[PDB]
């Protein structure tokens, strides 16, 4: 997470560093998911300080959602939108792009900075 702080690319339209990304593994894909595409990922998630660890692997199930429909935090609609199939991205997220000053307790404290390792398994339209 500190690495992303230093090295991570800004992928916010507004470029406020609210969302930062390192492409760790390059995908075989040439396409990215469109808004309204059903998205299939593996993911690991923690607060910046390593607390509240969560993963699709542990839940024995991929995390499936439709892109750009606010099913997930702003940071995910922005971040997975940049990703290619087979790609693994690292994300460091400002609370403004996650749960904000209100947070979401008990899991998400007030003004929490999140870290995600996401693997984009696939995406489909229709
Ligand atoms: C439009 O804005 C929102 C959209 C959706 C939500 C609800 C939470 C949502 O989760 C997320 O947005 C992100 C990104 C997708 C992976 C999960 N996630 C989380 O933030 C994680 C959180 C990662 C950081 C360590 C603590 C757990 C994360 C993981 C959680 O448990 C797996 C979690 C949670 O809620 C605070 C956040 O618990 C609530 C869900 O209980 C279990 C049920 C379903 C599985 O979790 C889901 C399902 C769908 C969406 C999410 C969780 C709040 C939003 O407000 C900003």
| CA–CA distance, 104 with 15 (Å, rounded to integer) | 25
Instruction: Name residues whose C-beta falls within 8 Å of residue 18's C-beta, 6 or more positions apart in sequence.
Output: 12, 75, 93, 94, 96, 97
| CA–CA distance, 68 with 65 (Å, rounded to integer) | 9
List the domain range (segments joined by +) for residue 100.
1-126
Instruction: Name residues whose C-beta falls within 8 Å of residue 107's C-beta, 6 or more positions apart in sequence.
Output: 52, 54
Q: Could you confirm whether 116 is annotated as catalytic?
A: yes
Q: Which of 40, 43, 63, 123 is catalytic?
A: 43
Q: 62 C-alpha vs ligand 1 centroid, how far in Å?
A: 14
**Ligand 1 shell residues, CB under 6 Å:** 43, 45-47, 52, 54, 63, 70, 72-73, 76, 99, 104, 107-108, 114
E strands, the chain, where?
9-10, 19-25, 38-47, 54-55, 63-66, 88-93, 114-124
Instruction: Indicate the number of domains in the chain.
Output: 1
Instruction: Identify how the structure was determined.
Output: X-ray
């Amino acid at each position: 997470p500190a690495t992303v702080t230093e090295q991570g690319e800004d992928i916010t339209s507004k470029k406020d560093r609210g969302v930062l990304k390192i492409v760790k593994r390059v995908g075989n894909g040439e396409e990215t998911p469109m808004i309204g595409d059903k998205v299939y990922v593996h993911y690991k998630g923690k607060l910046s300080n390593g607390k509240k660890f969560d993963s699709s692997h542990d839940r024995n199930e991929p995390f499936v959602f439709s892109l750009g429909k606010g099913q997930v935090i702003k940071a995910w609609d922005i971040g997975v939108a940049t990703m290619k199939k087979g790609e693994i991205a690292h994300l460091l997220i400002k609370p403004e792009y996650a749960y904000g000053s209100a947070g979401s307790l008990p899991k998400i404290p007030s003004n929490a900075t999140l870290f995600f390792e996401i693997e984009l398994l696939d995406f489909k339209g229709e």
